[PDB]
Subunit: 250 residues, 2 copies
């Protein structure tokens, strides 16, 4: 419904000045679908290098931020620092921070509200484990994760949010969700947004899919009506990222 | 202090913008600093390139944290190879805020420490007890257990690239600095532990620095104690008096 196709690339903990320059040069020479909104997320120490050298139509995302303006939080980055460097986006609630670093639903919610209130746009990650899906709890998990943010941010705040549904069993495993599998979750998420936030927020909020998206499976995924794009991990380090940006082309 | 070079680190924590950092750096670049003092400053990761390129080269730069692996799917983490790739020779590990807020275990800090040392970094390793552990007579048990976790993993020659920062948690940011006698008593216990558990040579040559409400008004009396080899400075490292602390022995 007029939702602009969105492809994010999460580089995670990967890259050197040399390999990043090469990845940036590949993107700077690429032929990109004019209708795709593209964001890439480098490790924090390379945000200046990428932001200074990357084509300006591709915006830069941080991979995390904290909940406060400044203070005694060794090793944390604040939203104000991102704004200071010209970084407009931040990924929050990624599965690796929820599991490895124990980030709670409320912690992600606090981060999301702080980011939005201070000038950033948010890629908000949600997703169930294999055990939660096997237990029949997929929707219970992803709606509880979303509900923590919905209770904290205004209806207007959602215009600056992209939702990333990334089932944990699909992340890095090579087990991509099937188009039907992804479609049925995004439809249920959008339905949840209609009853709990508003019908307009449901209609305009991009819900992107992440988890083993690559050049060979992205075209079929992109045809599903409630899938508005991708959050791409392993493939965002490779030239194939360009084909995923161009997944709505024939 | 047994030919141990005096060492002053500034941990900027989650503070700074390009503008405030330029001013901070200009104050240091113009300052008269004791040549007998080793000086290290730790900006947030997003400003490591800005600081590393504009700061006088007799002051070294540190990251405030790093992860345990060379690369991989660890959204929001920085590796030791990225620090080496950026020319950042130090890293602070085990800081209380990471232990308490972010839940870093003794073993996790130890894994980071060994990985960082193995890949060419030098480590400021933070240890220290809370108010409540001290109220139960556990100061020595706590700080030696935090230390033993690193000792169990690193070799004797690795200690030449380690500085120990004793920062009692009740003194961090609270304005309740350790008295010279309180701090000296713990530092002597730490050096004793090193002599009994590693080697006499490691005990004699390892800098044990003190952190916790150090400022220009209390650094000189603290620096007179025989087993205090310098300071890890928090809030005052953002201020001109950081120079006074660098010159605490002159």
């Amino acid at each position: 419904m007029a939702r602009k196709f969105f492809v994010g690339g999460n580089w995670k903990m990967n890259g050197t000045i040399e390999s990043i320059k090469s990845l940036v040069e590949t993107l700077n020479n690429a032929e990109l679908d004019d209708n795709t909104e593209v964001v890439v997320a480098p490790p924090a120490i390379y945000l200046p290098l990428v932001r200074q050298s990357l084509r300006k139509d591709i915006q830069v995302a941080a991979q995390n931020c904290y909940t406060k303006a400044s203070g005694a939080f060794t090793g944390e980055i604040s939203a104000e620092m991102l704004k200071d460097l010209g970084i407009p986006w931040v990924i929050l609630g990624h599965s690796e921070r929820r599991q490895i670093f124990g980030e709670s639903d409320e912690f992600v919610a606090e981060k999301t509200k702080y980011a939005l209130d201070n000038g950033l746009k948010v890629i908000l990650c949600i997703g169930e484990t294999l055990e939660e899906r096997e237990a029949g709890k997929t929707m219970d998990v992803v709606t509880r994760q979303l509900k923590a943010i919905a209770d904290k941010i205004s209806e207007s705040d959602w215009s600056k949010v992209v939702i990333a549904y990334e089932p944990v069993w699909a992340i890095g495993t090579g087990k991509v969700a099937t188009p039907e599998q992804a479609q049925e979750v995004h439809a249920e998420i959008r339905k949840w947004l209609a009853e709990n936030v508003s019908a307009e927020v449901a209609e305009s909020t991009r819900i992107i899919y992440g988890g083993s998206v690559n050049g060979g499976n992205c075209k079929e995924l992109a045809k599903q009506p409630d899938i508005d794009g991708f959050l791409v991990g392993g493939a965002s380090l490779k030239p194939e990222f360009v084909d995923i940006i161009n997944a709505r082309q024939k």
